[PDB]
Amino acid sequence: DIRILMCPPDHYDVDYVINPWMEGNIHKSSQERAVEQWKKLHQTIKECAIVDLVKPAKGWPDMVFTASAGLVLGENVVLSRFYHKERQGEEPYFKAWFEENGFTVYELPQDLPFEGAGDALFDREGRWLWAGYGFRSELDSHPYIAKWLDTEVVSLRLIDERFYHLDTCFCPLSGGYLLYYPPAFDAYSNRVIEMRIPPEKRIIVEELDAVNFACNAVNVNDIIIMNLVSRTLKEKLAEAGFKVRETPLTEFLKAGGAAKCLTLRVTEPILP
């Protein structure tokens, strides 16, 4: 009953620069290698969850990054309104997928950016929604989300342009654990995190792992899937009870995304 939406890299390239990882990388991706990497990730995820696919649209290479299609809870989705025109053309295709698959879609005002699960991730027990802002999603979008989805929203301010989406530096896990990179957040936001997640449940990443997108991890039950990380972090995760599966995603890091960015969990139960 866990289903994840992905989108294959049929039209994938680096064609523009809308985050720091893309600088110097235009046309530096190998589409064939990207296909191989994506297929390995898809197979690994499919061993843990059902994978649904949306057909990619030519001219929107970042459509592979389905985490930003929208924010799902129950039968509802808040559709993303992308900050950059370079991704705004993905919106009708994602909307069509959500409507075809039975979701009720909420749409933000056109002038109010919000980038979906890329910037907003539920606490895994459903106690609240963590929502990033500062580079893509506007803080003013958070009340809309709170009302549309009937959830407390805990807003977190991102301060490092490399970690421009919440999901690149912050990953709620099963068992109450949180995998995150504190320097991506301002001091107040770190205090907000710390008030809610006690130290024994924090899995703190160091910069070396952060810049390899360690926090951009897919977690299904006790399995965590990520691009590549240190033995130090792998041992911390194993001690917390997680089975780590690594799979190479270098062609996607050239666009500033990794395993989690390539996925959207479309089964998010409403929990009592």
Domain residue ranges of the chain, discontinuous segments joined by +: 3-265
φ, ψ dihedrals at 214, nearest 5°:
-55, -35
Burial of 241 (0-12, 13-18, 19+ CB in 10 A): exposed
How many CB atoms lie under 10 A from the CB of residue 59? 12
At 50, the amino acid letter reads I
Residue 154: count of CB within 10 angstroms of its CB: 19
Say whether 165 is catalytic.
yes
Q: Of 42, 142, 165, 169, which one is the catalytic site residue?
A: 165
Structure tokens at 16: 């523009």
Q: Which amino acid is at 136?
A: R
Method: X-ray
Distance CA 45, CA 219 (A): 9
207: tokens are 């910069």
Active site residue 261: yes
Q: How far apart are CA 242 and CA 178, in angstroms?
A: 12
Q: How far is CA 4 from CA 66, 76, 189, in A?
A: 9, 15, 29
Of the candidate CATH numbers 3.75.10.10, 3.40.50.300, 3.40.50.720, 3.40.50.920, the domain formed by 3-265 belongs to 3.75.10.10
Beta strands across the sheet bearing 218-220 = 218-220, 223-226, 243-246
Rounded CA separation 271/269 (Å): 6
Beta-bridge partners for 220: 223
Q: How far apart are CA 43 and CA 155, in angstroms?
A: 34
d(CA 168, CA 81): 19
